[PDB]
Design a protein around this motif. Structure first.
Motif, PDB file in Angstrom:
ATOM      1  N   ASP A 266       3.148  -0.166  23.841  1.00 34.35           N
ATOM      2  CA  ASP A 266       3.906  -1.628  23.405  1.00 34.35           C
ATOM      3  C   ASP A 266       4.029  -1.686  22.075  1.00 34.35           C
ATOM      4  N   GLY A 267       2.704  -1.944  21.205  1.00 39.22           N
ATOM      5  CA  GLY A 267       2.984  -2.235  19.905  1.00 39.22           C
ATOM      6  C   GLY A 267       1.848  -1.463  19.459  1.00 39.22           C
ATOM      7  N   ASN A 268       3.094  -1.041  18.043  1.00 42.50           N
ATOM      8  CA  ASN A 268       1.972  -0.030  16.518  1.00 42.50           C
ATOM      9  C   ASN A 268       2.153  -1.341  15.615  1.00 42.50           C
ATOM     10  N   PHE A 269       2.095  -0.954  14.447  1.00 40.68           N
ATOM     11  CA  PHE A 269       2.164  -1.032  12.628  1.00 40.68           C
ATOM     12  C   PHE A 269       2.042  -0.121  12.062  1.00 40.68           C
ATOM     13  N   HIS A 270       2.895   0.030  11.580  1.00 36.03           N
ATOM     14  CA  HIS A 270       3.525   1.103  10.116  1.00 36.03           C
ATOM     15  C   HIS A 270       2.876   2.587  10.755  1.00 36.03           C
ATOM     16  N   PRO A 271       3.510   3.253  12.018  1.00 32.69           N
ATOM     17  CA  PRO A 271       3.057   4.146  12.312  1.00 32.69           C
ATOM     18  C   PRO A 271       3.180   5.342  11.405  1.00 32.69           C
ATOM     19  N   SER A 272       3.294   5.554  10.749  1.00 34.07           N
ATOM     20  CA  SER A 272       2.439   6.737   9.410  1.00 34.07           C
ATOM     21  C   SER A 272       1.986   7.667  10.064  1.00 34.07           C
ATOM     22  N   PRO A 273       1.652   8.519  10.762  1.00 31.95           N
ATOM     23  CA  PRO A 273       0.665   9.583  10.790  1.00 31.95           C
ATOM     24  C   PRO A 273      -0.638   9.566   9.729  1.00 31.95           C
ATOM     25  N   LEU A 274      -1.582   8.957   9.962  1.00 28.71           N
ATOM     26  CA  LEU A 274      -2.430   9.008   9.288  1.00 28.71           C
ATOM     27  C   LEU A 274      -3.541  10.814   8.399  1.00 28.71           C
ATOM     28  N   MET A 275      -2.891  11.354   9.086  1.00 29.01           N
ATOM     29  CA  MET A 275      -3.258  12.767   8.776  1.00 29.01           C
ATOM     30  C   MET A 275      -2.463  13.074   7.230  1.00 29.01           C
TER      31      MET A 275
ATOM     32  N   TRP B 184       0.890  -1.070  -0.413  1.00 32.37           N
ATOM     33  CA  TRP B 184       0.354   0.139   0.555  1.00 32.37           C
ATOM     34  C   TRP B 184       1.336   1.031  -0.077  1.00 32.37           C
ATOM     35  N   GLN B 185       0.223   2.021  -0.430  1.00 32.61           N
ATOM     36  CA  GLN B 185       0.961   3.735  -0.167  1.00 32.61           C
ATOM     37  C   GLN B 185       0.464   4.942   1.080  1.00 32.61           C
ATOM     38  N   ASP B 186       0.898   4.816   1.438  1.00 30.39           N
ATOM     39  CA  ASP B 186       0.717   6.160   2.596  1.00 30.39           C
ATOM     40  C   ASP B 186      -0.092   7.143   2.284  1.00 30.39           C
ATOM     41  N   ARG B 187      -0.537   8.239   2.743  1.00 28.65           N
ATOM     42  CA  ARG B 187      -1.683   9.435   2.723  1.00 28.65           C
ATOM     43  C   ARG B 187      -0.523  10.422   2.016  1.00 28.65           C
ATOM     44  N   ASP B 188      -1.014  10.867   1.199  1.00 32.09           N
ATOM     45  CA  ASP B 188       0.007  12.514   0.668  1.00 32.09           C
ATOM     46  C   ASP B 188      -0.258  13.333   1.264  1.00 32.09           C
ATOM     47  N   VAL B 189       1.615  13.995   1.592  1.00 32.59           N
ATOM     48  CA  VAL B 189       1.132  15.227   2.252  1.00 32.59           C
ATOM     49  C   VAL B 189       1.575  16.417   1.557  1.00 32.59           C
ATOM     50  N   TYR B 190       0.606  16.968   1.791  1.00 30.73           N
ATOM     51  CA  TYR B 190       0.612  18.710   1.088  1.00 30.73           C
ATOM     52  C   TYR B 190       1.186  19.688   1.883  1.00 30.73           C
ATOM     53  N   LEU B 191       1.167  21.128   0.388  1.00 34.24           N
ATOM     54  CA  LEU B 191       2.007  22.690   1.037  1.00 34.24           C
ATOM     55  C   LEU B 191       1.343  22.518   2.306  1.00 34.24           C
ATOM     56  N   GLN B 192      -0.016  22.599   2.330  1.00 32.94           N
ATOM     57  CA  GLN B 192      -0.659  23.535   4.115  1.00 32.94           C
ATOM     58  C   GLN B 192      -0.666  22.495   4.824  1.00 32.94           C
ATOM     59  N   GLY B 193      -0.445  21.030   5.058  1.00 33.36           N
ATOM     60  CA  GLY B 193      -0.426  19.814   5.781  1.00 33.36           C
ATOM     61  C   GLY B 193       0.245  19.655   6.486  1.00 33.36           C
ATOM     62  N   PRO B 194       0.241  19.202   7.447  1.00 35.31           N
ATOM     63  CA  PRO B 194       1.103  18.501   8.023  1.00 35.31           C
ATOM     64  C   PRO B 194       2.487  18.272   7.710  1.00 35.31           C
ATOM     65  N   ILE B 195       3.343  18.214   9.150  1.00 33.50           N
ATOM     66  CA  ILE B 195       4.552  17.359   8.731  1.00 33.50           C
ATOM     67  C   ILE B 195       4.839  15.885   9.457  1.00 33.50           C
ATOM     68  N   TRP B 196       4.840  16.021  10.578  1.00 31.80           N
ATOM     69  CA  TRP B 196       5.183  15.400  11.254  1.00 31.80           C
ATOM     70  C   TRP B 196       4.279  14.823  12.596  1.00 31.80           C
ATOM     71  N   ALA B 197       4.044  13.917  13.449  1.00 34.89           N
ATOM     72  CA  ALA B 197       3.188  13.190  14.141  1.00 34.89           C
ATOM     73  C   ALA B 197       4.169  13.226  15.424  1.00 34.89           C
ATOM     74  N   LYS B 198       3.450  12.622  16.798  1.00 35.71           N
ATOM     75  CA  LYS B 198       5.239  11.978  17.930  1.00 35.71           C
ATOM     76  C   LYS B 198       3.829  10.964  17.541  1.00 35.71           C
ATOM     77  N   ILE B 199       3.966   9.579  17.613  1.00 32.47           N
ATOM     78  CA  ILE B 199       4.056   7.573  17.803  1.00 32.47           C
ATOM     79  C   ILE B 199       3.943   7.701  18.891  1.00 32.47           C
ATOM     80  N   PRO B 200       2.990   7.428  19.454  1.00 33.96           N
ATOM     81  CA  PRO B 200       2.393   6.974  20.426  1.00 33.96           C
ATOM     82  C   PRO B 200       2.987   6.004  21.690  1.00 33.96           C
TER      83      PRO B 200
END
Lengths: 518, 105, 105, 518
Positions: free
Chosen positions: A408-417, A389-405
């Motif tokens: 104990d576990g996570n899967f593909h922690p790319s921010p959903l926004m 799969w491909q992650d959601r695209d980023v935009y000029l006015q969109g967010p840059i980063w996010a803090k991974i919570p």
């Protein structure tokens, strides 16, 4: 240094090296006094909230914070165009942040008239949450970031946080944080503040669109050496059951064996921008996809990265499957569709399923001479081996980063926004005007002082980020799709100021224009 | 130093080592003029006292004083909880005191 | 060594360092003869099982085994309380195992 | 070492150097299985107790312990006589302890007949509470110490302890101690155990009696330069008030000024050994002096070191002011006065007040022409500046040391029963037979084993203590009082065995026979 000496210069430029681009942006900020120097417990009861799904408990602090978690805070439209038209990927590398030219003002009101004067001896306190000991609010798409236009002067947003809640009440596990319990630098008009940050290793963002689809990776000229069951009966009556097999080839690509399958799904409702194609009922909240946590329902928004619509179906969108930006001057509540900009992820239709469709069909019974074979629509599908799969695209006015919570576990922690997920993102930068008490009484009183000189502060803020570039090495013969301005005459230049000096961003700009094979 | 330069930073934190804990606390204070810069003789007659057990004689000074002789001036509730739940005893060892960012109005 | 000399001492204690805690536990065990020194094929037929979901096939051995895969085998309630009230996380690092003072009757 | 080799020799002797005496004693001990290898919660409910003052909560352990906290465990009567007749003081210096010649036996009963055989592979566990992490029970005058006679074989007492109690119930603050949670050495028949201990610095015990009284320290030939009010009236009627003063001299020693005063008091009731001089009522518990702790009354026993009786009043004793030892063969409950040995502290009458008298008299009003001067009997008096006193004497059969309770404050922590008070006394030495399970079932059972081979252990124990001596340098001309045996013929020799081999101690022996000035 001193009152009459500047503590920093205006740095705002972009430097394009071979595999790296360095963006520098400087803005002028204004910081008022928040909560009158007090910490205040807040909840849905204090704000009048009633619904269980929107209940909360938290605290509002007298501190402000600096936010530059939007791409337009660092990239000009031309720099963004260069980045998206010339690179297959990019990622942040390191950060430099500066606060300088601190100016603290005092405001005095006599009668309907306010006088503003300098308070050279007052201080402003700044510190960074480098240890991530405070709740992280930069991971939400909040307003208050540095303006995209360098000439705009912006107001520093007030820092607040939420903790565990039961209705409008708190529990024993709820935490209260005092930001004065942190070491912070105190700056007069002559002082400046600066720190450096190194981004942790993150994958390059996919600034490309696939030129192949996951179901069309085979050779269109050669048969497979694998077979399929073409018939089950006896064609042209009773007692007509006979197995059959055929070679899967170019004439029937749908039945060919494949090694990889499209990524996960969680079906959204479909909304048309042609209003008369929608149902004559109220279906926003009710018809929406949601998830539940401790009895509270939270909208699935934007949810898993899924194709916004099928080919040619541009009028439709997923009810909460896409980032929605507001045009310049758009109101806060109940605006029309022409006042907002609906982003779409059609570029990922080659690997990701359509947001408003079932993932597929799965057998639901055992076929026999008495029971016909039955299938069921897979409305949500989790991760399976072989999925891509491909992650959601980023935009000029969109967010840059996010803090991974911190879990104990996570899967593909790319921010959903959209953006880069990091366990240790850029730290929160918190700023507050030091309270300056008014004249105290001549007799001792043990109560905390509640009479302060009205003050606010202003200054310049500079942030420099180095970005690593992934150059394209395509062998494609025909020209690529490129983002371009339209030559046709218009009253205003896109991404420029109006006759009243108002800067506007007329459309969201993605990053996926170049192509590469799948 | 100068008018436009801060003379100190805000230090407020607790550092927990093995056998030692270091508490730092910073507060903002306000100091008015006391007794209009005068020394004044005071007594139970000046305050209207009558009982023998509460009679006194002394002086009120135009000076203020800094007092941090309460545990909550240095320990946050969480630090206090850690101290009381994890240690059989404690005692102060050394002190550092600072006054800075003086502003006279 | 010999009949009249102990082959080990009783070690049962917990040592709390800064970032590490070392737990030691000693127990007295008894080992009988299992299956009369034989290996035996076992199944749900031998045990009288009937359901498909509980059907099984295997073997019972004359061997015993040592198991210490429970936290209370190493942590006393007070040590557990200290661990849970003072630490955000923990994990095992290394193991030492001893058998001694063998007595066959 | 091995089965057929002894792990130690019999050491029992006293070595007298110049300023030091080294006592060594060896005894044979027997250790059974206590509580059948179990820990058991005990309380006044389990023992049937009813009174609030005697309520308790605690645990009984399967462990035994070695106790040598009595002087006769180390000093023979002749050595004790030498020590008390030739030294002004003494104190313990260092300790050596040994366990050796371990012998573990198994007992099998067939039918009314028991067979005892060696179990060469069984072990005995021994450890010392060097860190003082367990409740200290050696500070109480408990039985079970090493016998005074070296030939006697003694049984190791069972170790038990008490914790906080509310009636017969426990509280959350109550502590439960598992002695298997301590590292302990396991010894077969070939192994031995030993450790060394150093006594912390303690003052020398006063093995002397003062040859002067606190009220007779002045020169009997010279007047003081201080005056006293001899008369108040006008001798030989009304209106006869006139002050008077006289020199305090040898003729009136009671009114002379003095720099130091006798030590504290807490008055005891007076009991005669001539029964017809006592009241015809039950006055033991009711008439006794007591103190209260958390609503529980505990007898003041033996209490502050006070003179047992006035000069010549030998028939009287304080109701609980003195150590009472039992003669050989004396029963446990309700024995006559001739079956017990009542110690007395008449030697300290020169500095300490009489136990059955008021401390003194204190003014209780303001005398005037209308009110006569009034005084009140001081029945208890606390510590005052200038007070001097002597601690309770130690005895051959009395205790040696005690553990000072771990508290924020204490005053003169000399044990009230006599001896040396130490924050770190000799550690408790705990011993237990390792359980040996019987034949277990051939099918696994998760319950703890409750079938064990009946076992007991025996061996030798040696303790060596070095004592420091304080020699006497008196210039007294006339001979001193010395402890001596009586030459007059008797059926048995004092401090010897009877015709049945029973060793007896016919009288308590103090330490205060030599004299020195006050």
């Amino acid at each position: 240094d001193g009152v009459g000496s500047s503590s920093g210069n205006w740095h705002c430029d972009s430097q394009w090296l071979g595999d790296r681009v360095i963006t520098t942006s400087t803005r002028t900020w204004a910081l008022p006094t928040y909560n009158n120097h007090l910490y205040k417990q807040i909840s849905n009861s204090t704000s009048g909230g009633s619904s269980n799904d929107n209940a909360y408990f938290g605290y509002s602090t007298p501190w402000g914070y600096f936010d530059f978690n939007r791409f337009h805070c660092h990239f000009s439209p031309r720099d963004w165009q260069r980045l998206i038209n010339n690179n297959w990927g990019f990622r942040p590398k390191r950060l430099n942040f500066k606060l300088f030219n601190i100016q603290v003002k005092e405001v005095t009101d006599n009668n309907g008239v306010k006088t503003i004067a300098n308070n050279l001896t007052s201080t402003v306190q700044v510190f960074t949450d480098s240890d991530y000991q405070l709740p992280y609010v930069l991971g939400s798409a909040h307003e208050g970031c540095l303006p995209p236009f360098p000439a705009d002067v912006f107001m520093i947003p007030q820092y607040g946080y939420l903790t565990l809640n039961d209705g409008s009440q708190a529990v024993g596990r709820s935490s209260f944080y005092c930001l004065e319990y942190f070491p912070s630098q105190m700056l007069r008009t002559g002082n400046n503040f600066q720190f450096s940050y190194e981004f942790e290793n993150v994958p390059f963002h996919s600034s490309y669109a696939h030129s192949q689809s996951l179901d069309r990776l085979m050779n269109p000229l050669i048969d497979q050496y694998l077979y399929y069951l073409s018939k089950t009966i006896n064609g042209s009556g009773q007692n007509q059951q006979t197995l059959k097999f055929s070679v899967a080839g170019p004439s029937n690509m749908a039945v060919q064996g494949r090694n990889y399958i499209p990524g996960p799904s969680y079906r959204q409702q479909r909304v048309s921008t042609t209003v008369t194609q929608n149902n004559n009922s109220e279906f926003a909240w009710p018809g929406a996809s949601s998830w539940a946590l401790n009895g509270r329902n939270s909208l699935m928004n934007p949810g898993p990265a899924m194709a916004s619509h099928k080919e040619g179906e541009d009028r439709f969108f997923p009810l909460s499957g896409s980032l929605i930006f507001g045009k310049q001057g758009t109101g806060r509540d109940n605006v029309d569709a022409d006042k907002v900009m609906i982003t779409n992820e059609e570029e990922i239709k080659t690997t990701n399923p359509v947001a408003t469709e079932s993932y597929g069909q799965v057998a639901t019974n055992h076929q026999s001479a008495q029971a016909q074979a039955q299938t069921g629509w897979v409305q949500n599908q989790g991760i399976l081996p072989g999925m891509v799969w491909q992650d959601r695209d980023v935009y000029l006015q969109g967010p840059i980063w996010a803090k991974i919570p911190h879990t104990d576990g996570n899967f593909h922690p790319s921010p959903l926004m959209g953006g880069f997920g990091m366990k240790h993102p850029p730290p929160q930068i918190l700023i507050k005007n030091t309270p300056v008490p008014a004249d105290p009484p001549t007799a001792f009183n043990k109560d905390k002082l509640n009479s302060f000189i009205t003050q606010y502060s202003t200054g310049q803020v500079s942030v420099e980020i180095e970005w690593e570039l992934q150059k394209e090495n395509s062998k494609r013969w025909n020209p690529e799709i490129q983002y371009t301005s339209n030559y046709y005459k218009s009253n205003n230049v896109e991404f420029a100021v109006n006759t009243e000096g108002v800067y506007s961003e007329p459309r969201p700009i993605g990053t996926r224009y170049l192509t590469r094979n799948l």
